[model samples]
Target chain A: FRKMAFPSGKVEGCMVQVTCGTTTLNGLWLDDVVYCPRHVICTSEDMLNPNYEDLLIRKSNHNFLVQAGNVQLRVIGHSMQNCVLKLKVDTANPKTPKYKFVRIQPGQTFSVLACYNGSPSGVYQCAMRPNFTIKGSFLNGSCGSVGFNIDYDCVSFCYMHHMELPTGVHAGTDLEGNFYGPFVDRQTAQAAGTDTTITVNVLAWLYAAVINGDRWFLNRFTTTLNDFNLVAMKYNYEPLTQDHVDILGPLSAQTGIAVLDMCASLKELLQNGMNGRTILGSALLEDEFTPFDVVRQC
Target chain B: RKMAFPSGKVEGCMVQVTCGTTTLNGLWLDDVVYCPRHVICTSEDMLNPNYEDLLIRKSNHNFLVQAGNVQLRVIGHSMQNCVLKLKVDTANPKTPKYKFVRIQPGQTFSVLACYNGSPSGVYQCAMRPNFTIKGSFLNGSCGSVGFNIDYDCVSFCYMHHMELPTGVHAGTDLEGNFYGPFVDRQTAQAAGTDTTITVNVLAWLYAAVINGDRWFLNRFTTTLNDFNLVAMKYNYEPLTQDHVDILGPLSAQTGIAVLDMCASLKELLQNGMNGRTILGSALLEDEFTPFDVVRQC
Candidate 1:
């Protein structure tokens, strides 16, 4: 259980500063308390009122930053041989729901930053874990936390890096294809429903099993596929969302370098287009699945 | 002149019947004769030859078939005009060419079939001024003509109409919108070249000047102010060709209808917005022209 208290009076103006630290069973501070401002707290009025709705904090305005310290989470009370630690920032609320599973390890501490956005403010929460374990029997553990304040003085327009596809190269068909899934492993398959085979048309089966699988992975793995077919035809490419560009900007630049190398290979294939053996080996003649050899990794 | 054929029979494997109130005393219909199956010329192979002989026969009304059901059908007009205009490409070989011109009135003709082949094949040709099918048939107007009828039959099929709008609705900032034509007009006026003005812009100005049209008023006002705001807001380039392709097609289809509805609402809103701005600007400076004077054509 966690609790917040304000010993200092509310800071004047639009900004307020506070500090938080872990309390021991004896009511002593375990570590140093970090300063937090009014922008980091959810007030009673904020909780009750709807007109003063959720705040959209500018990252630049509020100089709040979070660095993930050693954090570990373990599942207990089950005979789970393998476990995964999922961490997600529920920027919308204090009750951090729908944690996105990022890594899986046995008895390891994963460090992650915890940021929450509540009505009228934003907050940064830090976590640390000790002696995390999962076994056939049940066990309990505790985690540590950290806090920080924001300075809204220095703010500027945020510049984002994005992917630029070659002219006439589409996203799905001509350019970067799709990534498939975290498919059901053998363990999950056996644990779920009984297997039964039914007569199904080949096209129907292929559409459901393969095409839909790729589509599902594409949706979850990247942004929405609004211009899927438009870009697929090779006349243009889809613009990357701000979130995607922020996360994978570096990787995108590196991928462009790889595309330049691929262009050389394409030139070689084009030169040998009509030759009998070359025609058979031409890159253009290959099916859509051929590019997967290079693209699957990225 | 009305000429009647009464029991006028000519016996032959194939024969040519010529009509029209004209004499063929020495002239031959052998070149224009039509037959149902084959020509009845004296030559062994009439197909290779291009000429035919005319046969004239005098007839009177005799042995009328009173036993048959006599149905009196009236046919009026016999001519219809067909218009054709060429929209040609003088450059690339691959590009398609088209024609669009309309035909003159009273120049259309139609052909009626009598038999399936030449020498025996007869066609009643008529030129009518109006769309009506009933008209007085001129004497000796009927003629036999040889043609490859099997491959040239007239037919019609239903097709979907191509009436889709082409332009897309793209948002331009207030200043960018307003300054575009104003700067252009100013440049043209500076250069003293009236030809520099685009026809579309001139058309709007003409409408405003001559007819006091207000259709372009709001667009001009909003676009001019929006241009300045847009310049201040972002330094990003306008939407590229690729971006247009992605957003254009559907927007064009849906936005055209949306803009039609938006026009009415915008007119009232713009009137209010412009009234306030005009009042404010007029009060600030004496050199500034009054709204009424500035807007007057």
Candidate 2:
């Protein structure tokens, strides 16, 4: 059984540091303790507190930076719930990665279309225009929940990559001029226990899916289909770098990059300036991992 | 007030526009005018670059009649002094209205339907501070207009794993007004008049506007369009009258329901609850104005 307590010199791993302007803030550190400040060690009894949102350490106005063994790597916030925990392996080139770990919450998911409102004070909002969005929570798991850390190879097939689509092409249509809309309406109909069908326009359905977080519909466009073949073709013609001028190229920007070469480039960029020793003991146990791996590893 | 001069009599004059005749029209016989076709006509002496905000001078409103096929169609408008100073109308009054745009004289905008034989016509344009349909924004040489996009073409161009209910006449007009696929209010009410009459309240309500003014804001119509789309997104149940009864009162007591609603929604989002109550909360949240009025509904 996993124990819920502050590391207290028991574990040797990297610690999370917040760099606000010039001053860097470190959490309660012991001789050999390693901890992620976002991970709250609450007992089953403590979980009943009504103000659960208060328990989360609000790291506002601070740049996320992690330090391990005299090396400081800037943690890239990929999404609100997912971050790139880099280990600085070489100083010659700052954008090269020896290892890239995607830090994520195990049970909870962030909508691919959703993003943080740049305020620890503000909540997640609609991506298209500034609007209200619900912040996702991961409070239901057993007491001790350290966030997940997956290396490049492990996360290659799982995470979404941003790609640019040609001007007239939308995510819902195939190349052969066939239309595929979201299944959210069908799913909602099924959820209502009603056998009813709804007719909606493709773009309208997609805009709604962006707000509602339809995984299947999102994946079908971003990953499962060849709609991103243009992006992949661009990559094949002229590969991109971490700081390439043509960063997602000129097209409609969509979430999730399923292209392997693009994933490698992103992984490298995510882990640039890293020491492999940061995630030393936190090895991924499965080829594809879920939150259960966090319980076993950390 | 108009004259057709001989094209052969003029040295290098060419017929610019045909007004049911092959002859050219000039202001005067000896008016050494450049080709009349090349002369740009405007109410204001100077031209403004911003096509959408072009203003016609008030002084020239009367005599500057745009006559014949040679005329420029006013595709945009501007106003001054709160009077009806400027106006725009479609090139052909019989054609679709193009809102939020400025089209060049004799220009037309059309969209290719996703389906092979679907209704093909110019998309209805809805302007700002008005209803914004969730669709694609298309642009032409003149300006941009909204397109009521149907589906992203999947393999072989067919409807994948979805069904369209029959007898629904749901469609958007060239002016972007959404109307029913359901039975018309007059027709449905007129149906059972000859014999025993019991009306289907649900169908009639959908056909009729909930709010006296705006059909877009009505409960049933929105449920069929926007709310239904949101429901599909979250995998939540469609809003029903029962849900409206529970949340309508809670909407009044928004202060008390703030934390409770957040908690309730948080649970549903975490577990993907497909309950009607969850959808009711989402619908209320969706309707929250200015975004910051309440934190999360």
Candidate 3:
């Protein structure tokens, strides 16, 4: 198995190898994990809301680490045999960690451990073969040969990376195979299935401006910023505003509440205007509003 | 003028008197016998004669005898100015047999007549009036008149009038409605409504004989006669005969039956046969049997 370290600045996480299967093996390897900072890890507030907990922990200065065990295999010629290896990490304690090895068969793969902490911070490892063999000897002198070795250090960071080009949106797929949404990543969104939760965020300053019905933000966002293309704009931003008190003060909160309720209607109006129409024979009229109206000002 | 009959003689039964300008009025006589038959009196023997025996023997004769006296009187104002003429005849050979008189106005006028034998012949009286400055009158009219007399006779004979010559007769009314036999009378006979029944009967027989299939007569009658004349002869007789036994006899029957049979067959031959086979083959022969076979021996 392999291991990786989280990014150093404000975000921290370890990249744990979750797979060491042959290239030809057909199975899933990694189970999803939520890695958060210790201070914000297990409180009811954090545990109750993963997004809140992740946001707080991501702001922390320290990073989590994950280490992996050795995984190696060799194959020659066409063969049906498989190299299976596994990794075991100690989730009993968060600060001091332990690792162990487990083996997985040809079609078998491993899942990341679910730590007892509500928001687990950890790394994982997995064993895999170089390539799958079918109905041939495993030693040298056959149709082909392959070797596998785990070299950890490949890391993946959870960052809100802005796309240079917008990904096309798509709908979700339900049991009956119906899809709905303004999905940014159409391909990934469809594969996520119907139950997958989606979250969209705009900067607080922008949100404040939008929730206050700032006409400038509404006009700029819907027209120049192309906020209408966002999946959240299509959803009426219901989930994002569910915890309104956490984000705004009382006086502004009431104002923000009224504006938020009107935001969808405003978005519709702006979307109509931005679709290229003149008002009283004047062009360049920034008329449409969307949830991203806040971010367009920024 | 006045006339009288002898006593014991029937009066008015055998005598007749005719006069002008005087009326025979109230002349009474005894022994006047009434006879309903012949409008005259007759002897008892003549009344009782055997009419049936007389007719059978062809040699019977009878006579009647009677008489009457007639008195003449002139009434009405115009009779005073009227002239009178009278005549009388008697059966007895005693007095002058005939007497005539021209009576002046206000004078008496009378006449009487008698017959000695059967009055089987016609007797007539006539009178003429004199044309005067005023109007003339005779027998109460202005035209001339006469009386005819004849004797009885019996006879029988055959009578004849002109006649039309026979052979191919032709005739017409004054309006020129002529009727004659023509060469195409056969066609006319087949076409006319008068000949429809006869033609249909013949058509049936012809179909039976020609088609040689009596079983198909119903269908044939329905199609040919009832449906349309053009549809007749829908099956060839000779060809049908070739296939069916009964058809042979029917064909022979048609060949011999004259009247409608010959006429219809001639028409069929003229029109050429029509049928499924003929239509199918598209070959039609207008001639029927050879002339030699058709010509009367």
Candidate 4:
């Protein structure tokens, strides 16, 4: 039983933020498989992307991998979690194992070098396990992995080399207990369940949840910033005041024309509807020039 | 018709030392080599004259081409000074000529690469130390640990050549040098083509002659072709230095007549003969320098 109150009335709609245990619940956020709720008081740009076939957004499950013959290991955290990023390696003659640790933040990356003892030409398999806890709410969850192996010729030292990576990352799984693929891009991922869409799709869902504040990552879901607002009011049944725009003007340089239009469109559609179904949550999420997305349509 | 003189020795020196190791580990040879031919008369006092530039002593000087990241050093075992010079092949160019730098014994000079991935190639060349002055030997570390002394043969000789008040001989080659061919220049080269040697050999000759044991003059002979008699008289006798100066112009006219036939004296030196054999030096990297080039090999 969660209690929400509009204290601001309709002229200036507001939101509900609750802290129970350690999980801070943002108004109905659309994460990979779950939606908490939405409100006009706050804005989350990531909640506006498109979804995939049978793309299940999970609220309480976790997933990762353990590749073979790992010369080096890397892990990226998409959500801000105050937890330990630790790695263990089994190597050396008589086989000695090594333990390493570090702190990781959302959008931050970490890397380790040479954990495997093998020949330049020889390839071998190794074991790895991914484990983490979300401070107060997440005690433990089911974790799954793929074949743990690597090749001498295929591997490279990766950090900021994001665009150089042609292969997609493996996004953790959903509640259906179903796993995913090497997720690379969004342009062709919606209808495809294969490797091409996993990470971008997972990324969109993270935005739907508002955990990823940055967009381009956000654009993957909603056509304009307005759409996130439309969806917010559609689902939550509330109207927003000039809150974020006022706050954004002082905090940031005036946003680009693209951002202004999206914000306007978002407010416009909220008070007025256009298509057959308002908030149909369909093909509408596919694209944008941002301010240009609206302009492109024109 | 031969006169007895001295000989000199040098173990090894360089061609130019410019491209000492472009070959890396590959070896090279001297562009010029000298060895003496005449033996007017023999004496153990003469120094060994061979410079053993064995195939083994060559080295691969540079390991990498990183600019602004290198150091240079010169080790002098032979009393003769060895100098290091540099020339830059740096494409954009600066003067494009060789620059000589002093190489003091027991010390090093620091150098750096001109650039990273710099196409500028650096080359170093060297020479046996020159006697900037006749008798004083340079002690390179003077600015730091030393008083910056010019080690001279005069004091070394005067102090040890002849016993104090006793007059018995005990001098080494440094002692014999006073009697060698180095003479105060002007009288040596009468035609007046002055400033010739850049640093005249006589610059070192006078310091020893003026400062060494007076009695030692009994054996020492000034370079014949360029002898100064008033000083000769003043050399053996307990006379005032003023008397030597007084006799200069007068004896210049008189001395040449009596000491003119020094052709045999020249051979004596080239042959490394007599007490004069002490003239030999490690500086004479080849036979040309060790023995009189005008004489034999």
Off by over 4 Å in 1: A1-36, A43-298, B1-257, B261-297
TM-scores, all candidates, are 0.12, 0.19, 0.17, 0.15
Instruction: Go through the candidates in order and give each one's DockQ.
Output: 0.00, 0.01, 0.00, 0.00
Give every candidate's TM-score on chain A.
0.16, 0.17, 0.25, 0.21
DockQ of structure 1: 0.00
lDDT of 2: 0.22
What candidate 4 gets wrong by more than 4 Å, as runs, is A1-67, A70-231, A236-261, A269-282, A286-298, B1-297
Query: What DockQ score does model 2 reach against the true complex?
Result: 0.01
Order of the predicted models by lDDT, top scorer first:
3, 2, 4, 1
Candidate 1: TM-score, chain B only? 0.13
Of candidates 3 and 1, the better by lDDT: 3
What is each candidate's fraction of native interface contacts (fnat)?
0.00, 0.00, 0.00, 0.00
User: What are the runs in model 2 whose C-alpha is more than 4 Å off?
Assistant: A1-261, A265-298, B1-71, B74-262, B266-297
Worst 10 residues of 1 chain B by lDDT: B1-10
Measured over the true interface residues after superposition, the C-alpha RMSD of each candidate is 51.8, 36.6, 85.6, 47.7
Query: TM-score: which candidate is best?
Result: 2
Lowest-sum lDDT 10-residue window in model 3 chain A: A136-145
